Amino acid sequence: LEELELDEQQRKRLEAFLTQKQKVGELKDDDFEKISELGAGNGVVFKVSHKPSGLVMARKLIHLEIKPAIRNQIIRELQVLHECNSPYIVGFYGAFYSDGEISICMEHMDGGSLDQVLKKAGRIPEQILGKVSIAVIKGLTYLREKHKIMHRDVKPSNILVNSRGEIKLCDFGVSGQLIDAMANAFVGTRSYMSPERLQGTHYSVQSDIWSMGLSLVEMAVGRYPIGSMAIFELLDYIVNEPPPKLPSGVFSLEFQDFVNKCLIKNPAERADLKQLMVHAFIKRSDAEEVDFAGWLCST
């Protein structure tokens, strides 16, 4: 509950977002104009301009061949995002369908994804990842406490940042129908899936913690930790081999222990959201003073 609290500036930023959002109504393709291309995934995301409101927005197009009934139910389930308001969760504006593609409109993050920052830094400093760890843990706790869902797709490409210093989660499993629909395509080249989910055993938000740990190891060493191999070899490596570890020299002992407790392959012994928040690595970085904006702007 203490992680769910916001400072004065975060409360002002959230209300300012919800105020600008209040000017938006029903979304339609005719009411949008493209600005630039924010990147691409397995799906394309455009920086767009909503003409009736004038707001800058991010529009993701998901190409699916699904029954219209399934398409409409996805739009209905995505409406839950209107109640997912947090300084660590990307704001949501609307969703609609046109030309065989489902549009998801959300808040724009000028900094981009933490996977694109890795390419513009090589490695990410430990105190920066401490703020990221705090943002991810708080965001995962918010989804579990307020909406009873997990993220199920934590990875550096789904942790977004901006010049205002904010670090928010995105692309989480808010729609049961959208999860099912996207399971048969969107083949990736790497993976952050927990070992227990890969094997079809019982899973929970612990899998998001494992995914966060692997993302932190990548952003710390500057390389994907699993194992060039194809996807199945990588998945097999995740199941069979012991987890990766952070180098012993540069990184602090607490940060190594933080990552190690995230990456325990047995999810029953893996640390949880509560234990991680009261971990020594979080408290040191929580009370610490870092200008993440300046580091993000330079990198």
Binding site: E65, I66, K67, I179, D180, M182, A183, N184, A185, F186, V187, G188, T189, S191, M193, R197, L198, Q199, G200, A230, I231, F232, E233, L235, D236, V239
Partner: protein
Amino acid sequence: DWEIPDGQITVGQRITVYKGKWHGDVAVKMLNVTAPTPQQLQAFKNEVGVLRKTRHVNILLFMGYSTKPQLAIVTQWCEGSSLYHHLHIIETKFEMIKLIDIARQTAQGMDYLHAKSIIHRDLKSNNIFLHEDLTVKIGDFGLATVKSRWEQLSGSILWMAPEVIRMQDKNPYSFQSDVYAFGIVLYELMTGQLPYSNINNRDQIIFMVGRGYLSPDLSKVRSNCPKAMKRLMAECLKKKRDERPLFPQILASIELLARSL
């Protein structure tokens, strides 16, 4: 010989594939990239070279290619919908005789391809068009290769043989992996469903199918399915590729089955 001059093809509505006009209706599959990479021209040259070796009613009719303005492959325009659209979007109620004939025609085209030493490598219901609701047309030769005497995972995982997913053998793709993809098509026809419909995790499907832990639930096969068809489907879906039959034998099994109805 099959190169089409610049100002002849009229491009129309986008369906990537556009509906176009060149001596009547045609489908035009283009590469919108202004600067084709070597891997792009490689794939384009490979696909045209494979398509020009095919002349069969159950293979999408290649008609020509254009290198200016954009790289484009021209084929016949198919009327109707794909088998994936029929089975999983509009749920067309095919009688069993038509389901068997769709399987027969698909096996007919694949047997032709394998006689030309062509491995399709991307057989799936989305690439089987039911032209005029009557004739199977096997399309999308974007991954097709010609097997000769002398890499990242690419395709749709539902139709991938375990050895294709694993990508560990010297030649993961073979005639028998095309047979496995055909076996999944048989599963679609005889169940009306995609496999692993209860599994909503793509990386779980990859690991478990490649490890042989997960395979299609053959109990979903409808009761009107003949016994010889479920048995042929199970033999096409064998995890070990050397136990799968080849398409000459698959064709004869379907034909005998079709007479026994």
